[PDB]
Subunit: 317 residues, 4 copies
């Protein structure tokens, strides 16, 4: 049977005998993603260039507005907003959403792949909503994922039931379930990080990357890929296996990527897909944040690859 | 004034007082590229998954082949997808030779990586009956070349004698909009792009040059690295931001990995028209004389200062 | 606040504290309509004409398949199928759907507006489902409406809460609520019927048409519009007011339009918008059908206009 | 072999060995029409309704056609339904063609999603004088090309030139007009008649009698069916495909009809005649009226020749 995102979420909600509030949220997000995809593909650009006589801000506006108007959210954290957004009372629901509306867009001039990342939490306390309701560890995630605006548009949705991949059919604006309950390879053959900053690498990073290019044994060296857009790199890691690194070093002891709307949703997708995601010192999903915009180093991907990195990492402890 | 692909090519053609034959070819290519873009974005995929109860690389080849054949402007067609050159049937024969990779990078499209179309256009040089040899011309002879990038958006980069022009596809109306005119690459970039996974097979010149980017001898800032692994995306980034792109030979590919006829030459021609460079290490890509339509070439291309810096390291190693 | 079809139906379902089975039906139907619209607009026509080297059947297949896979239906009545389709037990739900997948398509060669018409009944008994479960009067409808594929694509959905009109935004494949709680004008200035059958008209129809061209009260004559596609004519009637007539003639002594999947849903929509729909002798919605494909004469539209027809009809006994 | 509007126009131009200036015109027009179609289909309407936190379609359509034609470098004088005066193209953009167009005919009723369309007529500038309104005051006989885009269940561009009438279907997936009907000809006789019968009390006596013959045929033939969309492009296009007759005739209250000669009547008459049909005012061929005002009206009766002939015979019967 053909299965859409709308039908999938609705069928999971009836299975779980829920009220439908999470389904209203995910439906709203899905609508926002189709609008971002349409703008990312430059629909209407002819009207900008005079046929009849910013993108990350629009994406933020689409996500913020679809989420607020879903009546399912109370606190919204965006990479684009300095403070947490508090949903007005008449629209308040029980969920906290952290999102990067258009991750990687700083390089969209080269039409590089871009994406939207989101993580959904349940509001934990009965207190008035505030920034603190978004300061939960990734362990508490209800749902997380990303939309990849790549050669095609794909939404990856991770929940307790696993990870599911929905392809956007632009002809009809429907997300078609094309990969059910996806699992990452136990071990990959690709590593992904920016080697241009090699001189600032932690010694453990230097050694682990050196083993990937010059394996001690007779196995094939890994291939290298680094798109520079986290959603693109993580998705390839999910599909092909391997390891993605943005680790800590002395000049950036906390990594560079952000915990709430980059690392945690990707770590959560990875763990639901049978992968791993660590900072080097602990699982990403176990970091308890103190700032909505705090940074986290992240090493994620195939479990065997991530375990091997941690082995090199403790060696240098 | 708004400018489209269809308007731009027609206006260059009237300037040159041509017959319109190259415009008919380029229109056909443009139409095929919009069909490929539409398919690459998975329009109609719901019907594939049973909403009512051909691999993409094969479809893309078919779109280019058929639009080019029926354009009446071509006589010989070389595609990455076909072992032998395609000879256009007599009644449809025109004067141009086209080498193209219909869906470059498609082997990894499962991860939705950017993919692209690359093309190079030659005038058939000899009066012999059309054959594979008509496509064995050095890149210096190119009439026009470029690529379509199916990335976050779909962009056609078209290079001719008049320079490099970038057209953005407006999906809402199926029109290519001129968005960057007479494009020029930076004299020097800050990004280097290659698969460092083959570091154990790198020739000493490549090894030293990469060492200079991460550990600059002059205590300037190291370059950033990017590598999509899809040639059109990496070359286009190099064009837009500057820098250097390397795909040198390795043990698995002693004559390089990339193809001369429908990957290296068109990108080399786009780069040289954009004030960039493209070398194999020993000579300009555009100066290689091909002997086999599918032959491979090592390629280093991008900002002139960076490529010259590589060549100086290359000369240091004899 | 922006509102979609999916958001609207879901929030009405939560208001009613229903199981969600009707929402899955409408979601399925909405997906079918976007697919028909894209096909009606000739998306992909280039591939038919050889770029790389029946429409009424497709529409039926899309509706049949989306309704079956919603798990909400048990009996399906279509203009394209002689007998009712009985949903197989594993996909069986509680709703009975009568639909015209592509009304007006016999003249689609001239690109006339076409549409999809649907009526939704709840199955009443615990007997095994059969054709007779579709033999209910229009009074029993739970929901009804139509999709109009005209200059743009619009879904008009009628339920107990009223009529709501959603415009399809093709850029994102979303139905946007653009007209809430629609009500038809008390009286219009347009009458709509095939005057080519004037030689076969009942005397009351003959007199009523004379009144539109030669008004007894010295008011301005009505204009005439007749697209020949029922969804196009009825929707104009809804938007501008007036009256639409398909009365009996010699080739169609019981009228031509079908009661179950043309007359009843339009009659239900009109009554929910404050209009009327009659056969001349009784309300359309009160006819008890004995055949899934049986015909009905139908006069519908603005109440004052239809009441004026009933006045002329009553004059002729 | 698949054929698009872009290939078809380029192939006819090379045959005719033209400079390509008309091809640039038609290409610009085609681009304007795809933008109109996209807007008419309500692409982006979600942004009007607040999805992220604005001219009528007839104003935008006029803006699209004007700008694409101006910037084609192929036009000098432009006549639009939306402008009282003709537009004189600035010198640096000036070409040799005069275009009369209705940017979105039928749009006053677009609230009900009725079919709408764009109609155009293209002339060569005749005189060596500085371009002015006078250059659009040519009879329909002088048309180089004419046609319409129908935004109906699908979008179709009907392009008529000396070589005949060709129908191109718009494929939205790729924004290409695909040639689907070559060198189309209308039926010799149809079975549909098309006019607003609500104004019957104002009908000319010939119109009353001819419509009476369609509903009550004297010779025991079948009565005609009636269709009236109220949007001219839809009614004419149905007339072209199915045959029959379309009437917007003169009456006592409107001695010149209601439709406009320059950008509505002439192009439909030109399409009809290239398709082997007819179009008359009752008194002469539409294409033979010599206009004196760019916005002047003309009565039009068009469609299958036999149906039009039967109309003219009844019209002549009434002196
Ligand atoms: O629609 C109806 N009711 C609203 C839907 C109720 C819940 C159904 C599904 N549950 C759910 O989604 N739960 S959850 O928490 O979001 C969740 C939980 C876990 C994972 C996920 Cl992914 C989501 N009723 S009705 O009869 O159809 C009706 C009645 C009148 C008018 C209409 Cl128009 C329709
Ligand atoms: O169309 C017409 N003629 C055909 C077009 C002539 C070519 C004009 C432009 N030349 C050109 O593009 N040359 S080139 O070699 O391809 C070249 C050269 C250099 C760079 C590039 Cl990019 C391309 N005539 S017409 O009056 O419009 C006409 C007449 C009858 C019916 C119609 Cl429908 C239209």
């Amino acid at each position: 049977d053909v299965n859409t995102l709308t039908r999938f979420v609705m069928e999971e909600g009836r299975k779980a005998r829920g009220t439908g509030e999470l389904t209203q949220l995910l439906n709203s997000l899905c609508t926002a993603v189709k609008a971002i995809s349409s703008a990312v593909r430059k629909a209407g650009i002819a009207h900008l260039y005079g046929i009849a006589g910013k993108l990350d801000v629009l994406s933020n506006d689409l996500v913020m507005n679809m989420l607020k108007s879903s009546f399912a959210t109370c606190v919204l954290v965006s990479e684009e907003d300095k403070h947490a957004i508090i949903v007005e009372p008449e629209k308040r629901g029980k969920y906290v959403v952290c999102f990067d509306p258009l991750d990687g867009s700083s390089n969209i001039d080269c039409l590089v792949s871009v994406g939207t990342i989101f993580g959904i939490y349940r509001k934990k306390s009965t207190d008035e909503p505030s920034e603190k309701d978004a300061l939960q560890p990734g362990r508490n995630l209800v749902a997380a994922g990303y939309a990849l605006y790549g050669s095609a548009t794909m939404l990856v949705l991770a929940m307790d039931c696993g990870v599911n991949c929905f392809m956007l059919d632009p002809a009809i604006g429907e997300f078609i379930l094309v990969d059910k309950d996806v699992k990452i390879k136990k071990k990959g053959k690709i590593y992904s990080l920016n080697e241009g900053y090699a001189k600032d690498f932690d010694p453990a990073v230097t050694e682990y990357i050196q083993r990937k290019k010059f394996p001690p044994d007779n196995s094939a060296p890994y291939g290298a890929r680094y798109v520079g857009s986290m959603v693109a790199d993580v998705h390839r890691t999910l599909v092909y296996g391997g390891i993605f690194l943005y680790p800590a070093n002395k000049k950036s002891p906390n990594g560079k990527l952000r915990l709430l709307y980059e690392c945690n949703p990707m770590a959560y997708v990875m763990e639901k897909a049978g992968g791993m995601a660590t900072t080097g010192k602990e699982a990403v999903l176990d970091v308890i944040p103190t700032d909505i915009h705090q940074r986290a180093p992240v090493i994620l991907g195939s479990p065997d690859d991530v375990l091997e990195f941690l082995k090199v990492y403790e060696k240098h402890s």
